[PDB]
Structures are given as C-alpha cells and as structure tokens.
Amino acid sequence: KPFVPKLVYFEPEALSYPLGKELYEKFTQMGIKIRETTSHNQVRGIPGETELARYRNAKSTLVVGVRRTLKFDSSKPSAEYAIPLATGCMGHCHYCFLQTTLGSKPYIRVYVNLDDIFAQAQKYINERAPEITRFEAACTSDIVGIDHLTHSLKKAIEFIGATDYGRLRFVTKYEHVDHLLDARHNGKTRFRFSINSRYVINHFEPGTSSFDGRLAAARKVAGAGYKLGFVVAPIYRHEGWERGYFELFQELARQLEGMDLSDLTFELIQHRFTKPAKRVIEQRYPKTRLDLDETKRKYKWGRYGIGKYVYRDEEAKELEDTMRRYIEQFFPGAYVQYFT
Ligand SMILES: C[Se@@+](CC[C@H](N)C(=O)O)C[C@H]1O[C@@H](n2cnc3c(N)ncnc32)[C@H](O)[C@@H]1O
Ligand code: SF4
Numbered sequence: 141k142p143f144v145p146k147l148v149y150f151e152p153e154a155l156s157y158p159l160g161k162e163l164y165e166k167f168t169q170m171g172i173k174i175r176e177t178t179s180h181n182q183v184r185g186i187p188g189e190t191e192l193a194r195y196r197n198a199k200s201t202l203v204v205g206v207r208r209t210l211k212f213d214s215s216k217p218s219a220e221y222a223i224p225l226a227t228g229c230m231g232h233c234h235y236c237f238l239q240t241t242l243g244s245k246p247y248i249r250v251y252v253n254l255d256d257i258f259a260q261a262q263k264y265i266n267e268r269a270p271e272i273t274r275f276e277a278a279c280t281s282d283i284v285g286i287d288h289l290t291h292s293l294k295k296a297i298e299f300i301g302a303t304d305y306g307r308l309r310f311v312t313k314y315e316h317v318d319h320l321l322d323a324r325h326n327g328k329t330r331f332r333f334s335i336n337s338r339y340v341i342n343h344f345e346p347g348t349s350s351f352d353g354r355l356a357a358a359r360k361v362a363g364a365g366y367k368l369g370f371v372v373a374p375i376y377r378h379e380g381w382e383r384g385y386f387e388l389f390q391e392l393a394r395q396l397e398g399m400d401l402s403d404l405t406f407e408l409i410q411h412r413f414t415k416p417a418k419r420v421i422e423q424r425y426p427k428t429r430l431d432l433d434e435t436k437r438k439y440k441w442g443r444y445g446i447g448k449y450v451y452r453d454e455e456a457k458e459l460e461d462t463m464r465r466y467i468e469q470f471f472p473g474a475y476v477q478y479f480t
Contacts, residue, residue, distance in 0.1 A: 142288050142316045143230040144170075145202035145248065147186070149177040154204045157252040159290060163204050166289075180205030180249050195424055198246035199230055199347075202289075207251040210260045212275075217478045218407070219274035219309055223261055225292045226250045226281040231313060232347035234421060234428045235374050238280060240414045242445055248281070250290050258299045261306065269305040278310035285314035294323050301326030311371045311407075313345065315353035321364040330405065331366040333358050335392065337384035340376050343429050355395045362399055373409030375459050377451065378431075386466055393470035401471055408463050408479040410456055412448045 148167050154160035167174055177183050180203045188194030207224050215222040228248040229238065238244045251257060265273045277283045277296060287293040293310065300308040301324050308325075311332035323329075333354045341351055349357070362368045370392070378384065413421075418432045437449035450456060460479040467476055 143248075143285055143314075144289075145172065146200040147173050147175070147197070147202070149175045149180070149183050149201065149203040149247075151177060151180055151205040153206050154252050157206070157254075159250070159254065159292065160204055160252040163250075163252075163290070177203065177205075181243075181245070183245070183247060186247070191423060195246050199232065199248075201247040203245075203247050203249045204252060205249060206253050207257055210256060212260065212264060213279070215276035215279050217480060218279075219276040219307075220268070221261075221264055221273065221275050222279035223275040223277050223296060223308070224251060224257060225254075225277055225296060226283050226286050228280070229282045230285060230347060231282060231345070232425075233313075234344040234346075234425045234430045235376075235411060235413070237412065237414075239420055239424070240416050241280065244280060248286055250286065250292065254292060254295055258296065261299070262303070265303055265306045272305055272307055274307045274309060275300065276309055278312065282312055282314060283310050284312035284317060284320075288316050288319055291319065294320055297323045297325050297329050301328050303328070309369075311369075312357075313348040313354065315349040315357040317357045317361055321360055323364075325364075325366055327365065327367065329366055330369050331358075331361045332369040332371050332405075332407070334371045334373060335388060336372065336374070337376075337378070337381060337388050339378045339380065339384050340374065344376075351391075352395075355392070358396070359399070367403055367405075368401075369405035369407070371407045371409065372463060373407070374411035375408060375463065376411040377455065377459065382462065385463065389466040389470045402473060404471060404474040406467055406471070406474060406476045408460065408476065410451055410459055410480070412450050414446060414448050 155164060183203055186194055186201055187197045212221040226249055228245055230248060261275060277293060283293050297308055300306045307328050309330035311334050313334045413432055434449055438452045439447055439449055441447040464476060467474055
C-alpha cells in the first residue's frame with residue numbers, strides 16, 4: 141500500500157546525482173517501465189486515450205529530475221518558504237487545490253539535487269537570522285507519502301535539525317512514516333496530518349490513508365519526539381457538518397489521550413475552489429458529491445493569477461467560531477495558528 145509508480149521518467153542529468161542513480165538502480169531492479177524525458181515539466185507519452193485515463197495514469201507515474209529554479213516560493217500562512225523536494229501526489233482527493241494550480245502536473249515529481257536545494261535553504265536562513273525561518277515541504281505534494289522511495293524528507297529533516305535558525309514543517313494524508321521515526325529532527329520539525337469529518341474523508345479522499353492510519357502515524361511520530369500538529373482542511377459545510385466536525389475532534393482526543401498535547405497545533409482551512417475547478421473536477425471525478433456551486437460563495441480576486449471562491453463571510457466566521465469551540469473543548473492549551 142505504500143506508493144510505488146507503475147511508470148518512471150528520468151531526466152538524463154538526474155543520473156549525475158546520488159538519488160537519481162540510486163532510483164534508476166532501484167526501478168530497473170524492480171523491472172518497472174522506465175523512460176527518458178528532456179525536462180520534468182515536459183513529459184510525453186503517458187498512456188491513455190481519454191483525458192481521464194491520461195490523468196489517472198499520470199497519478200501512477202514518477203518523474204525524477206533536477207530543480208533548476210532555485211528561488212523558493214512563499215508558503216504563507218504555513219511558513220516563510222516552500223522547500224522544493226517534490227511536486228504532485230498519488231492521492232485522488234476530489235477537491236485537491238493542486239488540480240487547478242498554475243503549472244501543476246498530475247504526475248509525481250522528485251528532485252535529486254538536494255545539495256543545491258539545502259544550500260539555498262541555508263542562504264535563506266542566513267538572510268533572516270537570528271529570526272527563525274520556517275520551510276513548508278508539502279506545499280505542492282504529499283512529500284511524506286512519496287518519501288519511502290527517496291528519503292529526501294528524512295535528509296531535509298536532519299539538515300534543518302542541524303541549523304540554529306531553521307524550522308521544517310509538512311502535512312500528510314499517509315501513514316507510511318516508519319523510516320522517519322529515528323530521524324535526527326532535533327525538535328525543529330513540525331509533523332502534521334490532514335484530518336476531516338467522516339463525510340469528507342469517505343466521500344472525497346480516496347487513494348489516501350484512513351483516519352485511523354493517520355492517527356496511528358501521528359502517535360508514532362509524536363512518540364519519536366516530533367512536534368505534532370493537525371490541519372483541519374478542507375472545512376466543508378456538508379449536510380450535518382456541525383455534528384460531523386464535533387465528532388472529528390471528539391474521536392481525535394480519544395485517539396490521543398494520555399499523550400502530552402501541550403505544544404499541539406491546529407490549522408484551519410475552509411474549502412476553496414477556482415473558476416476552472418468545476419470543468420476539471422467533473423471530468424476526473426464524475427460521480428463526485430462535491431458541491432462547486434459558485435453562487436453561494438464569495439469570490440476573492442487574484443493578485444498575479446486568478447482568485448478563488450470561499451464561503452461568504454458569515455458562513456466562514458460560523459465555521460471558524462465552531463471549530464475554535466471544539467478545539468477549546470477537547471484540546472485546551474492547543475494553539476490555533478490561523479483560520480483561512
Ligand atoms: C494541497 Se494539500 C498538500 C499536503 C498533503 N498532500 C495533504 O493533503 O495534507 C495541503 C492542505 O490543503 C488542503 N486542501 C487541498 N485542497 C483544498 C481545497 N480545495 N480547499 C481547502 N483545502 C484544501 C488539504 O486537505 C491539506 O490539508
Ligand atoms: S493527499 Fe493532498 S496533495 Fe494528495 S490529492 Fe489529497 S489533498 Fe491533494
């Protein structure tokens with residue numbers, strides 16, 4: 141059940157780096173179909189005659205390449221920067237915001253030039269020291285879910301752990317965290333898990349680990365001394381959401397009881413979608429229950445790209461207030477970092 145690609149592309153230059161060489165050896169030994177591509181942003185010949193087929197096959201394709209854009213993007217409100225270790229995901233979350241993100245690809249990409257990437261992270265750390273600089277590693281990917289294949293996140297964790305002013309964070313929907321339990325994190329990595337109501341997970345989150353898997357993973361991670369956090373997102377106003385989310389937090393407190401939760405964090409993100417979401421999501425997930433009715437929403441305009449639909453102010457406040465009551469009830473002295 142850990143992700144293993146059924147098709148793999150390599151950039152030729154990728155073989156010049158340890159990880160690229162190691163992955164080429166791994167997959168050729170596994171007898172998996174391997175191909176060459178000039179650029180990891182330009183992958184041709186993924187199988188499928190329909191768009192739906194090409195999309196689903198892309199989600200089973202791994203692309204191994206070199207990160208050439210060594211400017212890191214901002215990753216607010218989570219962190220100062222997105223550290224680029226991977227992009228894309230094997231999951232099929234109906235609502236996934238990566239589906240309509242500019243220039244995102246459906247296939248999973250891993251970058252092999254870690255020396256370059258971490259060196260650049262250090263330069264960013266230096267530029268702001270002694271202020272703390274936080275890096276998000278799961279900004280455009282499920283970095284944790286992919287990591288059993290590469291150990292890139294484990295290396296980033298140990299890199300950041302050796303710094304004085306750097307911090308690392310990431311959020312996952314996957315339970316496959318065993319290889320990370322002995323990482324020398326040094327208290328500088330926040331290990332988060334995406335949680336939601338039974339309704340949302342059951343209807344919209346196929347291809348991911350279950351709620352119990354995520355919580356089992358959370359207990360391991362915490363027991364290994366990682367700082368622990370949860371991302372309650374997408375907060376979705378389905379029929380019976382009030383009770384649904386009440387039961388989430390009740391079940392969450394029960395599955396974590398005994399443990400010290402004095403440094404536990406929460407992040408709250410309401411369901412958002414873009415103007416092209418309807419056409420894209422319907423083509424890929426035609427049986428979905430996902431409500432993309434724009435008329436009931438408030439549009440937030442884009443800045444340099446296009447904007448997004450969020451719930452109307454009064455609906456969003458209602459969601460925020462309710463979630464904050466639940467977190468106060470079941471997790472007193474846990475910090476809500478933001479609602480957006
Ligand atoms: C893009 Se997700 C990358 C990290 C990892 N693969 C993971 O899923 O946790 C980051 C978070 O954002 C949420 N999220 C995704 N799409 C939306 C959305 N459309 N509206 C509102 N939230 C959305 C997901 O539930 C995650 O909690
Ligand atoms: S696990 Fe995260 S990145 Fe993967 S499809 Fe689901 S929301 Fe998107």
